[PDB]
Design a protein around this ligand. Structure first.
Ligand SMILES: Nc1ncnc2c1ncn2[C@@H]1O[C@H](COP(=O)(O)OP(=O)(O)OP(O)(O)=S)[C@@H](O)[C@H]1O
Lengths: 630, 100
């Protein structure tokens, strides 16, 4: 019976109440038979009317009533109010049954993710079809939930019991999401591991523009057309030699994915640029005087007349085929293209691996990816999937009967208002047209100010974590379809983890505490720890190897051991050892496997009998021998 | 760039500079420890025509001649790119090319 005040002056909308309750909390106002609930974000201190203040400036016991919705006739609670409060009405505090029913629903479409601040017993239900059709994004400060919330969503939505045929994709740049899903997700990386495939993007899966925008930097001369011409015959030549169904010479298009060996083009193209000609004016290849790249030497200059000013890109391209950092692209292991252009497989398996796998999640961690061409690649990954699903909407593996959900990490570096890349155009296209093809979208970014104003607005629902800077708040506060003066004034002070869900994916916008995932299933990135890695005493490093690796462009020493078996046991998990080469293999949590060298096996027997793992291993192994971690 | 920290660390730093001193070594940046693009920029100030094209042919030759003449582990006539830090003589480059 916390009576506060009752209405006495109604002036249309700005009501006034005389008196004788959290900020983000609704209120109870029964009117005869119908109960009225809403957000009265103005109460007391700011609710005192400026007009009457001159009489009693020493008190603030006024409340202005402007509701959000009304309780039906014993049926449910729906937005809007058929009548406004009048004289005599008294306002109470809402109760647990009201919270249950106001947020409760008899529809199975919704899904429970988090809990309400008032009483966690209430589950926070959110639509799933709107979430995958109307697009959404996640925002917050760098120290907020961010990546801890998205994993909870994907882990709840990817439940096999309730959604045995979910299908989503995730883009991660730090590779911070693999550890949360230890063996429930298909995670592909550039530097392969024991139980990880290769995140490979066949370069011939690109249009002429995209290919010209990665290995050439945007040639803008007559030579540019020659490359388009040159690729045409090569892509035409493969068509004649090998028969593909559905396409012939007449309808060939330079942008269709027909296999070609990029190796052949450069060897043919560059060779014709510089070479001695036995007969002056003879451009034939027979007047010049293959497994390995080594070009044969030629006599000094005549020079071949079949060439142009594209000498720099040619030598520029050849370099891109040498360094092993791009091996994901130009030397796809299984999709390696031979001299004649015939590959081992087609893209159907690639799609099968990316999305056709029995597992729900797909993770492409791009940390090892060169950062100079990261944006270009992002546009490539979005483009390929769309044309995979847009031409297969009728087929039983498309997005209509099996919707997708593309997730992007740190979008704000790729949705700049003035960005001139391929990612924004690719992303915009999905947002506009993916609606009817079952292609959703979730965005992650810690600074929306850089996100394009148009792109952010069309997002369906936004998970708004804590935001400190005043630039981002206003930008978001201007792109909210259904926002409340009682809920959005609290954005810069939300405790860690809890977010706010707003948009057309929920009946009401509510402040929920996303449930933390189980310990041992969280998004972790294994960055070096300076405090731990500097605290140890010095070691006489052997810099002679560091030079050979740098020269050789390798990362593995010649002193590695491969065929050593391991047996299960700070938290030591597995250990090996070998007296042939005195090489000791050790394995810890998170897949960390060292190899301490030049170690007698007397300690090995001691370690097994030491029965003091963790507190005893560091006694005589931590900083006493040379190791080349793997 | 002002050289105003060497006074702070009396005996806790290894200060390098241009003018050698009693115990302060002299900063040394071996000219052959540079990539092809940077080397052209530092010395020639930027060539665009046949000179930029011709010099690289000369740099390639010399770094080939050194390799056949001395052992560097791993690098061969196929694994050698122009920006592998393998020593070569700048004097030979200028003298031969200019003399010819
Ligand atoms: N529900 C939660 N309960 C308690 N602590 C949480 C909760 N959620 C997140 N945290 C803690 O706050 C930290 C937030 O950092 P992260 O989870 O790594 O997200 P983030 O760094 O903002 O996003 P990125 O993509 O990694 S930059 C977490 O590591 C937790 O320590």
């Amino acid at each position: 019976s916390t009576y506060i005040g009752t209405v006495q002056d109604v002036n249309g909308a700005n009501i006034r109440v005389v008196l004788d309750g959290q900020i983000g909390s609704f209120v109870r106002i029964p009117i005869g038979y119908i109960n009225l609930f809403g957000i009265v974000s103005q109460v007391g201190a700011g609710a005192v009317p400026d007009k009457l203040l001159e009489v009693e400036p020493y008190g603030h016991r006024w409340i202005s009533v402007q509701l959000v919705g009304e309780e039906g006739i014993k049926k449910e609670f729906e937005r809007g109010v058929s009548q406004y409060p009048t004289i005599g009405d008294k306002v109470h505090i809402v109760t647990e049954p009201d919270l249950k029913k106001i947020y409760g629903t008899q529809n199975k479409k919704y899904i429970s993710l988090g809990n309400i601040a008032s009483v966690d017993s209430i589950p926070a239900l959110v639509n799933i079809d709107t979430l995958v059709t109307r697009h959404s994004a996640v925002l917050g400060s760098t120290g907020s939930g961010k990546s801890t919330t998205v994993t909870s969503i994907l882990q709840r939505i990817s439940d096999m019991s309730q959604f045995p045929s979910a299908r989503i994709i995730v883009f991660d740049i730090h590779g911070e999401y693999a550890a949360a899903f230890k063996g429930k997700a298909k995670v592909y990386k550039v530097t392969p591991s024991n139980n990880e495939l290769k995140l490979s993007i066949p370069y011939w899966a690109l249009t002429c523009d995209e290919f010209l925008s990665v290995a050439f930097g945007g040639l803008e001369g007559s030579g540019r057309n020659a490359l388009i011409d040159k690729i045409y015959e090569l892509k035409l030549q493969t068509l004649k030699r090998q028969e593909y169904e559905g396409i012939n010479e007449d309808s060939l298009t330079v942008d269709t994915p027909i296999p070609f060996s990029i190796h052949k083009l450069w060897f043919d193209l560059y060779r014709a640029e510089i070479s001695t000609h036995y007969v002056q004016g003879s451009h034939s290849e027979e007047n010049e005087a293959s497994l390995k790249v080594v070009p044969p030497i030629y006599m000094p200059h005549y020079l071949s007349n079949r060439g142009k000013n594209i000498r720099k890109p040619l030598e520029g391209l050849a370099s891109l085929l040498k360094d092993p950092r791009y091996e994901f692209l130009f030397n796809a292991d299984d999709w390696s293209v031979n001299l004649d252009g015939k590959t081992n497989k087609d893209l159907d398996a690639l799609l099968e691996t990316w999305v056709g796998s029995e597992e729900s999640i797909s993770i492409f961690d791009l940390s090892g990816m060169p950062s100079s061409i990261l944006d270009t690649l992002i546009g490539i990954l979005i483009r390929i999937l769309y044309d995979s699903l847009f031409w297969s909407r009728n087929q039983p593996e498309g997005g209509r009967e099996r919707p997708l959900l593309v997730v992007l990490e740190e979008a704000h570096t790729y949705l700049g208002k003035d960005s001139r890349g391929i990612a924004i155009d690719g992303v915009r296209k999905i947002v506009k047209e993916g609606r009817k093809y079952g292609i959703g979208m979730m965005l992650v970014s810690q600074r929306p100010s850089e996100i394009d104003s148009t792109i952010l607005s069309q997002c369906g629902t936004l998970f708004a974590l804590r935001m400190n800077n005043s630039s981002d708040r206003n930008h978001v506060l201007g792109a909210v379809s259904d926002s409340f003066e009682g809920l959005m004034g609290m954005l810069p002070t939300l405790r860690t983890g809890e977010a706010i869900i707003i948009g057309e994916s929920v009946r009401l916008p509510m402040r929920t505490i996303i449930s933390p995932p189980p310990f041992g299933r969280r998004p972790d990135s294994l960055d070096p720890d300076v405090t731990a890695k500097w605290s140890n005493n010095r070691v006489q490093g052997d810099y002679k190897e560091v030079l050979t690796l740098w020269r050789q462009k390798k990362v593995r020493s010649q002193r590695i051991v491969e065929n050593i078996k391991r047996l299960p046991v700070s938290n030591i998990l597995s250990i090996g050892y070998e007296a042939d080469s005195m090489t000791l293999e050790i394995e810890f949590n998170h897949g960390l496997v060292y190899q301490y060298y030049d170690v007698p096996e007397t300690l090995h027997t001691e370690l097994l009998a030491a029965e003091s793992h963790g507190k005893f291993f560091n006694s005589q192994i931590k900083n006493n021998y040379r190791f080349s971690r793997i």
